[PDB]
Amino acid sequence: SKGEELFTGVVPILVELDGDVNGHKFSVRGEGEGDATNGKLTLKFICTTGKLPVPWPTLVTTLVLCFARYPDHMKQHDFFKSAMPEGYVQERTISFKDDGYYKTRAEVKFEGDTLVNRIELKGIDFKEDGNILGHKLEYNFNSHNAYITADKQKNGIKSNFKIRHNVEDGSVQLADHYQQNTPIGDGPVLLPDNHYLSTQLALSKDPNEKRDHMVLLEFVTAAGITLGMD
Numbered sequence: 001s002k003g004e005e006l007f008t009g010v011v012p013i014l015v016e017l018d019g020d021v022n023g024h025k026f027s028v029r030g031e032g033e034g035d036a037t038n039g040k041l042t043l044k045f046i047c048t049t050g051k052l053p054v055p056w057p058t059l060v061t062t063l064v065l066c067f068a069r070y071p072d073h074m075k076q077h078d079f080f081k082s083a084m085p086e087g088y089v090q091e092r093t094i095s096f097k098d099d100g101y102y103k104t105r106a107e108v109k110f111e112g113d114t115l116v117n118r119i120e121l122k123g124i125d126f127k128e129d130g131n132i133l134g135h136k137l138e139y140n141f142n143s144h145n146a147y148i149t150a151d152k153q154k155n156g157i158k159s160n161f162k163i164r165h166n167v168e169d170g171s172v173q174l175a176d177h178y179q180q181n182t183p184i185g186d187g188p189v190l191l192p193d194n195h196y197l198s199t200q201l202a203l204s205k206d207p208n209e210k211r212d213h214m215v216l217l218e219f220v221t222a223a224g225i226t227l228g229m230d
Contacts, residue, residue, distance in 0.1 A: 001190060003084035004075065007036035007066065012114045013043060015063050021123030022100065022133065024053035030063060032216075034115065036081070039069030041218040046211050054123070055137040056214045057165055060201065061177060062092065062104050064117050068197055068220035073227045077192030079150075079157050079181065085110035086185030088156065094163075097174040100126030109184060131165075131173045138166040141201040146177075147224075150191045156182035157192065195224035 015030035032043035045056075045063060052059075066080035080088065087109025094102035106119040126133050146161040163175040183189045197220055204215040 001082050001188060004078060004081040006084055006110070007034075007081055009037075010035055011067075013041070013064060013117070014111075014114050015043065015045065015117045015119075017059070017063065017119040017121060019054075019059075019121040019123070021054055021102075021121075022126045022128070024133075025049065026053055028052070028059065028063065030216075034064060034067035036067045036069060039067065039220045041067055041216065041220070043216045043218075044206065044209075045214045045216065046209075047213065048211075050212065052212050054132055055135055055165075056139065057137055057141050057203070058094075058096075058102075058132060058175065059121075060141055060203075060216070061094070061163060061175075062102070062106070062119055062121060063216075064108060064115060065090075065197065065220065066108065066115065068222050070222040071227075073230050074195065074222055074225050076190060077195055077222070077225065079148075079190050079192050080108075082188070082190040083183040083185065086183065086187065088181050088183045091180045093178045095176040095178075096126075096132060097176070099130045099132055099173075100124055107184070131167055136168050137173060138168055139203055140166060141203060142166070143198070143200045145196045145198050147194070147196045148192060149194055151180070152191060154180070154182055155189060155191070156180065193225060195222060197222055 017028040030045035070078045090106040092104045103122045151158045159179040165173040202217045
């Protein structure tokens, strides 16, 4: 359980994603750093294939929970850091209500000194004039709490949560997330108790950037476990 020692300082991050939504292929590369002591993520993502065929906020959850800030009375429930440096596989099914769904498989692991998140995404059954392919979502992201439960029969964790995307007309697009995480190596991992992760986000643009891009600042903090007289 010596994986949390790798996140004591600032760790560079590399994010690479290859996507295909209704045949529209695209690639996204992101770079930055994570500060798990504060639960802070600072990243800049670039669509290297030109124009992103999906809204940037719909990829936020796909584009490194090992940088969450776990309180001292909850370090024994940090599965993500315990699986490092070998890392873990993160698979998700994101079903957009009245629209298509994403299928993602990611490998979050250490490659040298850089935390790397390499993802393969596939989107199926999307409407060409819907909120996704039609670019009808606002460029923002609300605060959310993601409940984490343990999966002993898979030696990992699972989680299901609903992301509420703001639509430009005033409505809300629901994105039902179903997540599974399993370690890559064979070492011991910490199987947590029931808790949740609190996440806040700020999206912005780089004024000196001409490519399609997203500047991201994110805070992730763990909670839900009563401290007590500890």
